[PDB]
Amino acid sequence: ATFEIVNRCSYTVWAAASKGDAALDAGGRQLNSGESWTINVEPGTNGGKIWARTDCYFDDSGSGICKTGDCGGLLRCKRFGRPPTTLAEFSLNQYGKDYIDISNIKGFNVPMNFSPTTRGCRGVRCAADIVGQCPAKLKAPGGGCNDACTVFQTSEYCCTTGKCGPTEYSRFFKRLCPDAFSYVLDKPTTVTCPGSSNYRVTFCPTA
Secondary structure, eight states: OEEEEEEOSSSOEEEEEEOSSSEEEEEEEEEOTTOEEEEEOOTTOOSEEEEOOEEEEEOTTSBEEEEESOOTTBSSOSSOOOSSOOEEEEEEEETTEEEEEEEOTTOBSSOEEEEESSSSOOOEEEOSOHHHHOOTTTBOTTSSBOOHHHHHOOHHHHTTTSOOOOOHHHHHHHHHOTTSBSSTTSOOOOEEEETTOOEEEEESTTO
16 A cells, blocks of 8 residues: 655656546655655555656656657556566455566566565565676667567567467576566565565665
8 A cells, every 4th residue: 555666776767546537646856866655545456567767858738758668658656667677576465465566578678675664564676687687689779678579569478378388588687587477477576575565666776
């Protein structure tokens, strides 16, 4: 119900929180190095995601653009962010439980730790330097490292028929970040927590 979004990176980022068809709390906010943003997420939200955006520019009305994770050019996101985007995923109060995970299925742009601040479970993280190690063909000019489905648009990478296996590209993300989904059908890396737990999403955790 309460998430703290901390930016431990030495660079500014524009946090974002959405569930695809609506914002979570204010949906987005500028987050300078060291600043923390506290938001409230309604119990039961399904398919919620938190992520960071880099190199953004917003006018007074709140309209603009970012190089990674841009959401329809809005400061306060309603829709999901545009790849590459390391994703903090969660579905709350699902059958008495809470479910969280980190995903690289949509690429990686910023290192991240996702941990409960209440008891009953553990957190997950993906802090390796994926952007610096990013394969030549996946590097995104705007910054970040694209997932292979975003770059090649193939049934295999996008797991279109719900029938797909790991790939050299998915193995890259998996190699650097074991505890994060590297592709749609990756062995679940989801964590189960008590219903209504509180959480903290830290960007650049080992920074």
